[PDB]
């Protein structure tokens, strides 16, 4: 069911993220503390003990002092906390205190879903956003060669029939992009595609 941490680590490396990548973590990810460099991570909403629930991506741009938070579903912090019991305030505090001079950071996050409500490809869309992040850390959410391939639709429209074909096309293009840049993906493709299926939650 979905993507394992090993699977995502291998894809992130294949996409040219490796030098900037902090690894895969559960909800207790510390933040960007080591130094004021270009950095990223893949974080789970739940703690390791649950076995994992939802995958998120975090980026740090030192040039603007911005923490990018990517949720494929584009939920709000209030909605991430309601649904997933996930909050990352302490993380933004530890980071702003350790890296910014004015003790302030900018928090940039998506308002739009790229993923279908039943899909198990959250880990994989996270790999894709991190490819867009490491090549264009100034404009990563949209307006770059990687994120331009996907169609973001308002989050409030997530469980509506009118957007299903847009979100399915996004899932088809997610695989085409990954097959193009990742040998790990190509070699494990049938197992990955099946386990991260657009309609996977309906087939548990």
């Amino acid at each position: 069911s979905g993507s394992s941490e090993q699977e995502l680590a291998a894809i992130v490396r294949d996409l040219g993220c490796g030098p900037y990548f902090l690894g895969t973590h559960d909800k207790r990810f510390p933040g960007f503390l080591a130094g004021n460099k270009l950095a990223c991570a893949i974080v789970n909403t739940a703690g390791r003990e649950t076995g994992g629930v939802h995958w998120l991506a975090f980026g740090w741009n030192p040039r603007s002092r911005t923490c990018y938070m990517f949720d494929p579903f584009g939920f709000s912090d209030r909605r991430l906390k309601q649904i997933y019991s996930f909050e990352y305030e302490a993380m933004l505090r530890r980071s702003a205190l350790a890296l910014s001079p004015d003790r302030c950071l900018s928090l940039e996050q998506s308002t739009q879903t790229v993923q279908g409500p039943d899909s198990a490809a959250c880990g994989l869309f996270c790999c894709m956003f991190l490819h867009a992040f490491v090549h264009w850390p100034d404009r990563p959410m949209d307006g770059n060669p990687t994120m331009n391939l996907l169609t973001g639709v308002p989050n409030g429209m997530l469980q509506s029939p009118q957007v299903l074909p847009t979100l399915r096309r996004n899932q088809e293009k997610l695989y085409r992009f990954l097959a193009h840049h990742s040998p790990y993906f190509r070699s494990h493709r049938a197992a990955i595609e099946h386990a991260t299926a657009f309609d996977k939650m309906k087939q548990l």
Binding site: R103, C104, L107, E108, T111, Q112, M141, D142, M147, L150
Partner: peptide, 11 residues
């Protein structure tokens, strides 16, 4: 890509 919201957080 996706539309986004940018917020300033001070600690």
């Amino acid at each position: 890509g996706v539309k986004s919201l940018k917020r300033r957080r001070c600690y």
